[PDB]
Point group: C5
Chain length 210, copies 5
């Protein structure tokens, strides 16, 4: 037990203190970031301001060579945990939020020996959404885009594993029931510039539960 | 006066020895799992909002664990058997409500108690908004709501989450609350995910309550 | 320039050259004296049974490690320090419903006898049923204050008086105060022989006419 | 010019010991004035009123003096308010923490004078009864040091007229008058005077 | 091999600019700084006629250039730009002059630095400011204005400019409660009777009404 602890501390020291740390992606060395949503609750829909409040888990995954190790050199440790503040994390942002996002989970990432990092902040988000039709069978439809704030598609290649939002943990007694929820990778161009810009469009269709 | 300076010097030396001169706990591993014992003392149901299905609780969340790296012999430190430390200066478990709707608001100073056997006691008072349908709260049968607590990033092979009792402590519940408590339980649950052989642990806090009359 | 240099030297001597107070122990208990000056009952919410008070919380304690001879420091008898740079007691409301909001600069007064005076102005929401507030008899509410992590053998919590100071109470508040008391209470827990101390603030109030 | 500015700041902040605050032997004059921008809200259910104002604070320190000839003719600079001593001037009857609206930056001039002007939103205790009438409502709030007497911080004003020249013309509330009056008080315990500036605002619903 | 090399060069560059060099201490009269400012208005969220406050969501584009942030890409593996936390560089103290609550930041506080020493910083923000929404429920709509400028620097220290006087409405939320009739951003030069120096602000004027 002392041995496994000593190995973990040595590993973390080797990656965080003895090695220079990831400065972020470049055009020459682009980073793939995979993004997916698990929608937990539509808490509130405000038709006086056209803001809707969601609670979701935002799953982020990327992989770095600088975070790789051989478990045989570190007492068979295959993974560890680190504060999200102590590693580089992608600047993925909602583009149409109306209040700062509120974080609901401890800011801790999972690092595996292949260099892959898994970071899953639970969040409450207020975003721009007209809930007209929410009190009808057809329901309301709203959308919000997520993407890097400062990196193009040539620097952060943003991807999804599926276009289906995970609804398996959606709160069964929410005020709003979900008719559908999709997450679609979109490529966008700006007329100034040849590089592509990537976002993931979260489209949610919902109505008042009855 | 002389003894008093001595006891102070010993406390400072102890804290220095544990926090500055020793490497500090990096968290649990599969080879070295940590038992964390969890219990709730429910103080008040402040608010039940049927327009959003959120309920607000005030409770004390008792957390206890034990580390070898925090052990000392009181005889080597002027018979000091315990001390206090800021929660920011030690490792603490990442226990989280799984269905909160707003960041938890902390109501107490973030200070932990460390004893010479290496056991740590940390008891944040908290206000929590969580997902809850209060339908039936204005009836005799009352409303029932539930919220799970557990580690965000550690399985049952890394943090073994336990309770001392399945009864929520109601002995400090606010007697003039808007809501009276019919029952409150805290149940350790073990769960498996089909991807993975390891067990995942949570503590399910189930509260049954109604408007006071 | 002489008086400034002496103040800086004094603060350097107490804060930088000396090891600082690690907190009280069973062998070296600390007396903390507590008193309230109630300024306003801002709000009483009968839909949630929360009441909001604005008060000044007077805290006083004394440390040997903060003593000095004024003759060795140009006749300086007192100074000011940020509350973050000294130890302060962890006195807490036991039945608050929101984090306390601080209204005053977090500065303490240190006198040459080693006594420290710290008086945060605060807004507090706490658990309170305001039923009867719209009547002659009024509503009664209570909230306890005490250390979060220290027993009576470590922090001996005291009051100078059991009367809450109402001499600054806001004369055009929505609520008038019928009475306000602050009572030291001693409590035992069945696990443990040590006493636990709190100060119970009891306020009786009604809607003004 | 940039090298000289950096050298000056280094000389004042890093190479010199910094101002520990005023003493009885070395009292500090702090001059205070208000520019009232808006009465945002008047809440008669809680008797709280919300103001937006600029709070002008000025003082002078020998330890912040320099000769511009020794620093490439630099006569002034800017510094974060966190990197210098600032006075603990406080509203005595606020009901919520003050919200700061401007960057916390002070202006330091070569004579050692410091100018610090935080824009603030303040909720304070105020009965707005009469606000819906011609006579209007009257409210008051005192400002002063929290921990220094008049023998340590000598609090002054330049004028007793609140500056209303930037008052928001389409506010919900119009200002009938606004004054800022230095008051001296004695407490029976103590011989030292205690100073505050009483901000009295008379206002009514527009128009 | 190249990938390790490009990473090493980025780290060396950042170390050279942030650790081995002193920070820009801010502008002076002898060395004034041009700051270019522009707005992209995303939403009028709320108009409160009981307090005369309006809430906007916008992106505030800020650009300036510093010699101390220049480098030759040939000396750093052809790196032409990088990203940095806004806390690690000097940023201009541009402020709304008639806000009623602290601005709420909606984007990560990261700036873009290019090898010519130019810095681009674009905080997304929610702002409450003083605004009478009377006429918002009519065809002519309501008109409100808010000035932006340096809090502590004159026109001889920060020369505040715009690239256009048209607010960018191309991302305005199509299902907002309020539709925008017009939105302009006008550089103004102000003289104060105390002082010969000019004071510069950018006046954001928005005309809007309830969507029908
Ligand atoms: C819903 C609309 C949005 C609009 C913004 C968008 O961004 C800008 C300028 C941007 C467009 C794309 C090309 C360019 C040119 C250089 C560069 O500068 C930005 C970062 C990346 C970089 C260095 O390549 C600089 C930067 C920090 C951008 C932050 C804002 C955005 N970031 C993500 C992504 C990069 C944009 C596409 C979309 C955008 C957020 C959503 O990108 O500039 C500015 C704002 C005001 C809007 O009008 C648009 O136009
Ligand atoms: C109410 C539903 C909840 C669902 C989440 C749950 O967690 C995930 C993936 C997770 C399931 C269990 C197996 C696995 C595989 C590796 C690992 O990764 C997470 C940390 C622990 C580790 C290393 O063993 C990585 C991590 C940071 C998990 C955060 C989320 C959760 N954490 C606590 C606990 C670990 C889960 C059971 C429950 C869960 C919070 C409540 O766990 O992955 C993701 C989210 C989106 C949900 O769909 C589920 O599925
Ligand atoms: C209105 C009811 C309240 C109940 C709490 C109370 O505290 C606990 C356990 C506590 C009772 C007294 C004996 C003991 C044993 C060791 C010790 O542990 C606490 C700190 C002091 C120490 C080391 O002596 C550990 C600690 C950090 C206590 C924080 C909580 C409280 N602190 C102040 C004071 C110390 C208690 C009396 C009262 C209490 C806040 C008010 O105290 O344990 C836990 C909570 C959940 C409640 O059920 C009770 O019981
Ligand atoms: C509207 C009523 C207010 C009442 C307070 C006032 O302050 C106290 C005690 C105070 C009265 C004046 C004399 C004395 C004696 C020593 C000293 O202690 C304070 C700081 C200055 C010092 C060292 O000279 C210690 C300190 C930190 C005081 C903070 C509170 C105030 N500060 C500013 C100014 C100093 C006071 C006049 C007014 C007061 C804020 C407004 O001042 O003590 C306590 C509180 C509870 C009230 O009842 C009164 O009485
Ligand atoms: C909508 C009205 C506003 C009014 C303010 C304005 O500023 C003051 C004094 C100011 C006017 C211009 C000349 C002068 C003289 C020296 C100097 O002092 C300020 C910083 C710049 C400096 C050193 O040149 C000192 C400082 C920190 C100013 C902060 C306030 C403002 N700053 C930006 C800009 C500098 C002003 C024009 C406008 C102003 C914010 C908007 O500027 O003083 C004070 C306040 C109370 C108002 O009455 C006016 O008058
Ligand atoms: Cl990293
Ligand atoms: Cl630890
Ligand atoms: Cl101390
Ligand atoms: Cl810089």
């Amino acid at each position: 037990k002392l041995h496994s602890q000593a190995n973990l501390m040595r590993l973390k020291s080797d990656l965080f203190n003895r090695s220079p740390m990831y400065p972020g992606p470049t055009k020459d060395d682009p980073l793939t970031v995979t993004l997916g949503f698990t929608l937990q609750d539509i808490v509130k829909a405000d038709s006086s301001t056209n803001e809707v409040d969601l609670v979701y888990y935002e799953q982020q995954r990327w992989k770095l060579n600088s975070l790789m190790w051989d478990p045989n050199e570190y007492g068979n440790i295959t993974d560890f945990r680190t504060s999200a503040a102590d590693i580089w994390t992608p600047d993925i942002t909602a583009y149409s939020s109306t209040r700062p996002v509120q974080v609901l989970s401890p800011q801790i990432a999972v690092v595996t020996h292949d260099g892959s990092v898994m970071f899953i902040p639970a969040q409450r988000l207020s975003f721009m959404c007209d809930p007209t039709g929410v009190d009808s069978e057809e329901g309301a439809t709203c959308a919000v885009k997520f993407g890097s704030w400062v990196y193009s598609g040539f620097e952060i290649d943003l991807k999804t594993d599926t276009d289906q939002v995970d609804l398996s943990s959606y709160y069964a007694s929410s005020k709003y029931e979900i008719l559908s929820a999709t997450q679609t990778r979109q490529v966008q161009h700006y007329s100034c510039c040849p590089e592509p810009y990537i976002d993931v469009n979260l489209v949610v269709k919902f109505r008042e539960r009855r």
